Each structure stands twice: as C-alpha cells, then as structure tokens.
Amino acid sequence: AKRTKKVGITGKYGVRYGSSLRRQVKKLEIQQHARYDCSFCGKKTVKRGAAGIWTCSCCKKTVAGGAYTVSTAAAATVRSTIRRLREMVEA
Amino acid sequence: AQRVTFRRRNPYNTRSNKIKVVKTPGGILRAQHVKKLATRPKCGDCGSALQGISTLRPRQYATVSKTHKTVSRAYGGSRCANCVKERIIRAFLIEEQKIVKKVVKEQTEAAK
Amino acid sequence: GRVIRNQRKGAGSIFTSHTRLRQGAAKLRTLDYAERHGYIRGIVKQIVHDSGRGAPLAKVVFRDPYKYRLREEIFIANEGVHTGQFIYAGKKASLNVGNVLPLGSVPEGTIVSNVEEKPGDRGALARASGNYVIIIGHNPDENKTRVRLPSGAKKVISSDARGVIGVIAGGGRVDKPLLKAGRAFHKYRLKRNSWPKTRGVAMNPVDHPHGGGNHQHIGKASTISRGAVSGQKAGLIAARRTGLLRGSQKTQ
RNA sequence: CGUUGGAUUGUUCACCCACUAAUAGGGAACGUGAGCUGGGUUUAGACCGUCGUGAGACAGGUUAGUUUUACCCUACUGAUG
RNA sequence: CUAAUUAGUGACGCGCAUGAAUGGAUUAACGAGAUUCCCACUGUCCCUAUCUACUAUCUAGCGAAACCACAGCCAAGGGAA
RNA sequence: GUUGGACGUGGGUUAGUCGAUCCUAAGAGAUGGGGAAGCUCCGUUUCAAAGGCCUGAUUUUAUGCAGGCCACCAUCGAAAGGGAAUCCGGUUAAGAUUCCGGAACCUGGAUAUGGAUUCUUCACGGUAACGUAACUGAAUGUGGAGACGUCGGCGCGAGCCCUGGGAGGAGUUAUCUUUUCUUCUUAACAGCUUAUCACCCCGGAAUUGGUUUAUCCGGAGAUGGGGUCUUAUGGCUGGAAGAGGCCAGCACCUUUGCUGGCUCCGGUGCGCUUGUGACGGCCCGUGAAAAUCCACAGGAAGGAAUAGUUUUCAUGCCAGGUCGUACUGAUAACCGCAGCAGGUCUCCAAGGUGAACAGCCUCUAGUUGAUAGAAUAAUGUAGAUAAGGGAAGUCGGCAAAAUAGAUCCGUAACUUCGGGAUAAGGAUUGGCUCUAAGGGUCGGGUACGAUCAACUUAGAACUGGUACGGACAAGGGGAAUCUGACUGUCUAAUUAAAACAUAGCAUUGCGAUGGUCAGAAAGUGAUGUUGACGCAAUGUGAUUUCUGCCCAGUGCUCUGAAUGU
C-alpha cells in the first residue's frame, strides 16, 4: 500500500527545513542511491559511496562519476567533443 | 553472580585490553586476557582471502613452518589462483600477438 | 581594541588545515625525457576519496625508466577514467579522456583539467570537482596557448604546459542543499576551523569595526579600500559595485 | 463605635460592578523590607521607535534579572525569684 | 469577552515617529520564551484547624563569631532644625 | 576512647613472558645554513662533499682494499594507540600471572644425532581447488599482515540465568512439603577433529530457477551431485586428578596429622552480558602512522656416488640484564586551608515484580560509621489531610492539586501532506477455573503416524463490602496574540532569552609575479596535502511570497579627463 503521497525517501526529515529544500534533496538522493547499468559487464551493479566514485558489485570496476549520478551532462558532451576533435587528427 | 577483575594495570576497554571469562580447576571464575584476532592474508591482484594459507598475527608467521605460508603452485602465497590463471593466458596471448604485430608491420614497410 | 578574527588566522594556530587523513598531494608526473619527447603508459590502480576534497583522486602507477621499480603517482580523477585503464602521458600522445598532453598538442575546443601554469609545476588550474579549462587558441610563434579558466578569465600560457583531457569528477556536488548545521559541521571538520561564523555586527567594538551600538548595524559604508590596513579590512573589500546583480552575467 | 466585597492597572490615584447604617478625610521617618513580597523604578543580557558619522543617548515602548545577620541592650509578651 | 476589563482579541488609520536582506508580509512544526481567556484541578482565598519527623527547649561533654566611645526607662523643651 | 589513616618501634614490594623499555600520532627539536646589537629567531631535508650494510680480498695479520649495492639524512614525543612470548594449584601478619610446585612458550647464541633429499641433483602426490614432517635460493623488486567509522536486525560461541534424575551435607517438620538451601570443577599449552564465507570438478538452465527476517544471484555458467580452503569456535584425548570441591570414620597439649569414600548423567531459550560472523543503512563525514613479521617474482651462486646438499621437519645444549611491583583510589589515604553533604577517568554485575541496567524487596560481599540522654511550648524546616465554595487570593494560579501504565473505541482547525495526535473524548484492568489458535524432531515404494520442549494472543465461566497499572511506577488539556523557523549555543558565581549559531538567500576580493592574514628581520610563516563546484571577507537569516524609488552626501570603484593643484 502506498505509504506517502509526495515525500517518498525524503520523509525522514519530517516537517523540518521547508518543502522546497526537501524537494531538491529528494531528487539528488534518488539519483545517488540508485543501481546503474555497468558499461563493462552489463549487469546493473553500479552503486556509489563517496561522491564521484562508482563501482560494480561483481566485476569490481570503479568509475569516476558525477557527485550524485554516474555520468553528468557536461562530461557526456565533453566525451563526444573529444571524440569529434580526435577523429579530426587521424583523418 | 561471581564477578571478575582485569589482570593488568590497564583499567580501560581498549582493543589490547580485550577480556574473556574462564572456569578454572580451582572451581572459580577468572578473567584471561585475549590477543586481538588475526586476519586472513589477501591476494595482491584481487584481494580475496587467499586460501591454503594459515592466519596468524604477523610475527607468529616466523614461528611456523613454510608449508603454512604457501601453496604448491607458482605465485603460491601471493596471488589467488584464478588471478594466476589470467596472467598466464594474458602473457601468452600478448607474447603471441607481439609476433603478429611485428610481421604485419614488417610487410607494411615492404609494401607501401 | 582587540585583534579581530581575520587577523588571528595568519598566525596559524587553530586555523591550520586538518590534514591527517589526506591521500597526499595531487600532482602530474615530473616532466621528464619520456613526457617531453615521447609518451609513457600507466595503469590506474585505484580511484579513491580524499578527505576534505570534493573530487576523487586516482592512483596511477608507472615504470621507472632509469631504474627497475614501480613509481606511483596521485592524479585528480577525470570523469570517466576507471580502474585498470591505461593512461598515456607525453608530447606525442593520443587525445583521450584521462591522458596528459601539452596544451600545444591539442586542437582548440579541447577540454582539459589540472593544467600547469608554468610547464613542470605538476598542475595548478582547474582542480575542483566539476571544473575544467577550454583551449581557445594557439600562437605557434612563441608557442603560447590561450585558455579560459573556470572563473571566466582568459590566460595565455606556454604550449609546453601540460594538462589532462576531460573534466574533473564528482561534479554537481553544490546543487544539493546542506539542509542542516551538522552537515556543514562535518563538512568543515575535515577542512579547517572556519565554521560557524559570528557576525561582526553581533560583537562589541573591541572585537570588530562593525561591533557595538544600541541597534545592530554597520554604521559606515562597508566597502573598504585596498589601501586599508590590517584590522581595517572587513566587509566588502575594494568592491567596484555592490547590490543585487541584475541581468545576465557571463563576460563577453 | 464602625467605614466593606470585586473587574482593569505595578501602581498611590483614577474608573466601573455590587453590597451596605455608611462605604468620611488624615498623621505616626510621605508608620510599617534583620516583618514579608519584589509587580514598578534604577546596574550588568536583549528587541523596536526616535536621535547620532560613531561609541552611544532617550525624564519613550518591551523582556530576563541573588532581597544578608539578632545569641546583646532596651521595649513588648508571657515565666521564675 | 465580563455584573463590572488602564487587560485580551477583531476592526479602523493624515501612522508624534510602520515599511521592504537596516529585509516587508505570510507561515505548518517546534519553545523551562512574553501575554489573554476556557475546562479540569485545587488550603491561593473565604478561614482557619489537625497530624508526623527533625529542631528550638532542659541536661553531660564540647564550644566559636559579629559587634563594642561610655552606656542603656520615658514626655516635652531647646539644640547641628 | 582501652580504638585509629594518631604516637613509638620494627617488618614488608621477588618477573625472559605484567608494564616501562621499542615504534610512530598531533607535535617538539639539534645539525650545513639564513636573520638578529644580542639574550636568540627561522628552517628539518631545508640551495650541504651529510652515511653503513653485506661479504669478499688476508694465510707478513690483523683488518688495509677489491666489487656491488642503500641515498633511507638526527633525535624526543602514548604506563588508554601499534607491540615476541605463561598458565593452573598452593603459599604470607603484610608479596605474588613475580615465591613454591607442576606444566609451557618466546627471543638470542650455539650445535650434534635422527629423518628428509640426490645417480633424473635442489621432494612427491591431486584433473583441479590444493595436500605435506622436511623439501638450497644472494642482489634487486613486488605483495600481504600490522591497519582501523557508525548504527540496524539476523546467525553462532563463552560466562551468567532457569531446570530433570542421582550421589552427599545442611535447614523446617503441632500439622503440610519424595521439600527448602548447598557441593558435583577442569588453565595455558599440545594432538586429532570441527566453519559461515570463499573456491574447484562434473554438468548446461523459460514452464526461469535458487534464496534471506531483510530481493539479491545465474550462459562472465544458476539449481544439482561430488570435492578444496581459513580454524573464530566447539568436541574427544594428552596436561589431569596426583589438583581443587564436598562428605564419613578415627587419632590428640602440641608441630597437627591418618584412613577412607563420592566428585555422575542430562534439559531448555526473542533470556542477560560479552565476543564474533555473514549481510544491510548512512555521508559535500567514506572514518591514523611507524616499528616489525612473513610471502612471492628473480636466479647470483653453492652443491652428489664412493658419497654430497640440507637446520623454515624432530629431538638435544646454553642464556635472558636495568627500573616499577605495598596500600588508598575516596561522605577519612587525591584536589577543595580539614577525617569539608562539593569535585575527580574506567572494568566485572545474581533472584522476583516489570517493557526495563526504572522504582521497590532479596542472595553473595560490605556495612551498621554521622556526640548522647530527657521532654514534645511558641516559631520554624521537611512530609501529610481538611466540610461548603472553587482563583473571590496574587503583579501573575506562585505553591499545591488534578492527570498518567496498558488494551480497545474515538479523534477538530490548520498544514510545507511529513504532520497536527497520547489531539480532544470515552470503556476496560483482581483472583480463580476452563476453551481455542500459534511450533521441533525423526523412519515413508522409485493420508497420517510417533515423541519432546516453549509464554504469547483471544474467548468463556465462577468469585469479592464494585475492588483490581490496588505499593512502586506514571503526560493535565483546549482556544488565541506577540516572538524566534526548527535541533543546537552563552553571561562558571543575580540575565538561557525574543540574544548567538544554523541551513537557505545575497553581495565582495583573488588565476599564484595572487587574494586575506602573520613577523624585528629573514633563503621566514598560516590558507596550502590548496586552485574559483576554491580559499578569503561581509550582510540577511528555514519554507512560501515579495524585495519599489533615490548615486545629491559619506564610502567604494573606473578600459575616463588634463594644463587647476
């Protein structure tokens, strides 16, 4: 049965700190506690500890990620833009 | 109902002061101090507790015979088998492709 | 009156950095034969959390070219580098996230972190979580490179100055609210003793220019000149403007 | 010979309700703090208004703020001799 | 609201001298914070009474201190009023 | 005061294993140097010609030179961190892991016998995980141990708690109780054996399976069958019954014996404390260092058949210094002028009631210390009660009273949807006697039976001077205004608050030849193991909402001006 209407994980803060703050936090918390798909071994075993650090349960590979999420928008576009400029060098 | 005292000057619950209670032939309860538990040695490649090896506190490894400190395969008391399995296959295939790499660029120089 | 709070920090008593748990200084490899002629290969053996830092370090080991032994380095980890990955460092080196190359050897638009100010200093600019610098141009005669730092500033440095491809990891850290005093508390617990902050306006005159009065208030303009002397500088130092910033920021 | 009971106010004062035969005015170090109480005033904390560049000020508003000793002499109450 | 209210609350506003991070307005939750009323409760009161223990009190032993010009019954008079 | 922590006179503290000692922590601090008139200040690997190990070369000989390394560059700093190794019984007026008795272990130095190994020189076995009584290994290199947060439930161990049978001793016995109390123990160390996890072999999976209290795992090979490993921990045996515990039966001024017997077999668990494992939660917090020990990679070299190699296998020999070791540790051995109702770090922890380390009563142990006697006036201090009224008392309900556990019913405005809420408001609660539901374990060809061990929950009768959370224990509630968002902080000793802080919001400075700050100076220092998602400097003060106009003045600032000072 549905336990809470909005607060979700964020209900540990009870009534404190004001809703907008709890809003923002609930976002990044859901983000940071999630299991992510592993680039290398294919299972979703990637979890976090220590912001910026993302490792795989089996396969034991650790990746340097964003603070609350594995890949961040910036690093993503940066990735492709390095790809672009690189291919300009060989061909 | 029978209570007990530390056997040393040290009054406090620090990890070197761990205690155990024991019934003696005198028929009474008495503390006996307890050394910290030893931990299993670990593979350098991966980090699992490497099997076959006895687990003692570091200086006790000097008081034991060499069979307790090794297993019979190469990299015995060091790496974890399946890890050694890998560095065999890796070594071999790389040393092979190293031949494949030379003769291909040996021709590339000759036809170009 | 008393010596105010911002004067007492320089004597470094209770204000020195809380250093005990730190992994050790993050630096690029020494700039040597291999790195300025060829390239040299390494493995990231680990990527690890440094205390009081936003962004993870990466332990990267190399072979010692002049002696049989391993030599381990501490890098700030760029987003996307991973354990087991091979790192290449040198003048001639492929352009890939995680590698370290001289700023001259990368095209404009290239994005790099931990970039050196002078060549050899083992990195200065853009080390904080999320940050990078962009190469905005080259001057091959006198071999300089023009970059834009995180502040928005545009600086020109030697093209020999090394940098590492990609951006620094752990970005977005500052988007999450601290939400409570304790989170801040543990935050500065691993940095230095800067927290919490008493307002000068809550103090007595002995303590601070702002101190005193039967109502809390500054009493004179809080914009202080550069020419000001120690014990005088508190509030807004050398401010060229003040007030809510309206309209777009972002230098032309 | 008696001259009161209450609502608001720290109040004296004022002002209403109500009873009553009547709800007279005064003194006693503006009786009476080793008799009390401590609400006001009037130290040190603090908010606001006004004034002052400021420290700070206000006979303006507001809140929190340690009430010591008698076994002596006399007086007084009783008590022996 | 009360029998009665210099109290409280809701209104009104040419507001001595409200007012916008000198932050303005609103605000669930929280408070050994200031204030008002209500229910319960009651010796707070009308109006006092009674009980327990330890004191005080009398005895043995033990045994200080403060303070002290000289001292210690009043009315009036004058007199540093 | 015959007593004492007083007075007088003596006696008493035993270590290879317990501490110091060794290591490193924040930190402290010599040295080549650089400052300073100088007492001295700075720096600690820093602009320095910074030192010592392994063996070979000697057969004038004792240690010169021949190699090759290592460039690690003082030292001090933990009686709670790291750390080689000891236990049980007995014993003193007072010492004991220190003495005695027995039984071990470590380190260093010596070493010889046995075993192992070799004519295939430097061991075999197993498909494998890996096995072992052994099974050469210099430089160099690499790995591991030392070595690490916190909370949660779950599993297991130990000690304690509860308890059946029996063998002893004790208590009660008008009556009743096959009863109440008590003894029944097993060290370090050693042998064999014992494990969650992990891993190997066979096998090839949808009809997806396995599986935790907690949803995690499998074609990167699950479920299944068979094996391998760690030895926390437990079991049996050695130690070791000869010790210790409990009894009976004799001896006698003594030192004090002597002789016997018994010391056995079980059960139970959301119990309690503590240890530990496999997991899970948390973080802009991810939770020391060094000494030291071992291993592996490497293969320098040294080595046998007429006899070599081996001291990481067994047994054997010698040695282990210096200092502390008594006692108190607190309502009398410390600090408070004192034998002061104050202060002062910590380990062990029985039974009942009960949610309980609460209160209240008890066992073991320890106390019974605090001037005493006689009375019980006033006034007190501390503890209680009061008819009818019910805040009329007071600045003010100050003080006091009321409430309270648990099960069940029932619960408003408003709200950031999380709360508000134990809202408010109600019923019930003893004793005794029954009923019902809830589990374990074993054999079933390739439906059930049999046995043993637990207080929980609900329902039903009976019963009482209508009592029953019977003592103890235990929230008063409601409607508003002002004010601070909240948790948190301060005026030790008159102010705890609306003051301070906080998250959030905003502004300012700075790209290192720098910002802010320290210093007499410096080859000086903090931020800095740092780099704008940063450091430094101010203001406002959670959320929601909104932050208007004024740059003349005072400040601050400027790619500006120029013929005034």
Ligand SMILES: [Mg+2]
């Ligand atoms: Mg002792």
Ligand SMILES: [Mg+2]
């Ligand atoms: Mg602990």
Ligand SMILES: [Mg+2]
């Ligand atoms: Mg073994």
Ligand SMILES: [Mg+2]
């Ligand atoms: Mg082995």
Ligand SMILES: [Mg+2]
């Ligand atoms: Mg070999």
Ligand SMILES: [Mg+2]
């Ligand atoms: Mg430092």
Ligand SMILES: [Mg+2]
């Ligand atoms: Mg601080």
Ligand SMILES: [Mg+2]
């Ligand atoms: Mg501030």
Ligand SMILES: [Mg+2]
């Ligand atoms: Mg502040």
Ligand SMILES: [Mg+2]
């Ligand atoms: Mg102040």
Ligand SMILES: [Mg+2]
């Ligand atoms: Mg000043």
Ligand SMILES: [Mg+2]
């Ligand atoms: Mg000023």
Ligand SMILES: [Mg+2]
């Ligand atoms: Mg001021």
Ligand SMILES: [Mg+2]
């Ligand atoms: Mg102000």
Ligand SMILES: [Mg+2]
């Ligand atoms: Mg009156």
Ligand SMILES: [Mg+2]
């Ligand atoms: Mg009145």
